[PDB]
Design an enzyme around this catalytic site. Sequence first.
Site, mmCIF file in Angstrom:
data_model
loop_
_atom_site.group_PDB
_atom_site.id
_atom_site.type_symbol
_atom_site.label_atom_id
_atom_site.label_comp_id
_atom_site.label_asym_id
_atom_site.label_seq_id
_atom_site.Cartn_x
_atom_site.Cartn_y
_atom_site.Cartn_z
ATOM 1 C CD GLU A 16 -3.231 -0.513 0.135
ATOM 2 O OE1 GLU A 16 -3.168 0.611 -0.412
ATOM 3 O OE2 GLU A 16 -4.155 -1.318 -0.124
ATOM 4 C CG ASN A 76 -8.460 7.138 -4.288
ATOM 5 O OD1 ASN A 76 -7.682 6.286 -4.692
ATOM 6 N ND2 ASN A 76 -8.616 7.408 -3.005
ATOM 7 C CG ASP A 96 -13.630 8.659 -4.971
ATOM 8 O OD1 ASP A 96 -12.476 9.052 -4.745
ATOM 9 O OD2 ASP A 96 -14.190 7.831 -4.234
ATOM 10 C CB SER A 135 -11.641 10.155 -1.631
ATOM 11 O OG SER A 135 -11.353 9.007 -2.401
ATOM 12 C CG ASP A 153 -6.357 5.920 -0.924
ATOM 13 O OD1 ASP A 153 -7.523 6.064 -0.525
ATOM 14 O OD2 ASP A 153 -6.090 5.355 -1.985
ATOM 15 C CG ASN A 179 -10.911 6.747 0.504
ATOM 16 O OD1 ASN A 179 -12.061 7.154 0.614
ATOM 17 N ND2 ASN A 179 -10.169 6.996 -0.556
#
Length: 129
Positions: free
Chosen positions: A35, A46, A48, A50, A52, A59
């Site tokens: 990750e 991301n 959308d 958002s 991370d 998120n």
Amino acid sequence: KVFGRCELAAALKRHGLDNYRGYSLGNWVCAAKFESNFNTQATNRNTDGSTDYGIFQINSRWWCNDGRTPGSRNLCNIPCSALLSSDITASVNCAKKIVSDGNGMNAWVAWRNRCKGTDVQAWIRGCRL
């Protein structure tokens, strides 16, 4: 901060992640590797809108507030920047909430695609724990 493999393993163990919700330590270390590459300061945006954050790439849409994800929920009650600290406590406490969400570790796409069903024990091999 960029953690070493065994260093992280020991820190996670200390924070009660070994076998938390049935997931052995190797699972958490494998998830962190893919990750964030063990980097607490890792962020990724991301599609959308958002973002991370941190070692576990938590998120902003549901878990933390970054002040720029419209209509998000902040379930861990923390600013997303807390997730980038060299002190992993916030990331760990929030990850515990996420893994308890019903979907288990499948909540982490990298775990699902690169750790799930693999010899995750190999990730703590050689560490003084």
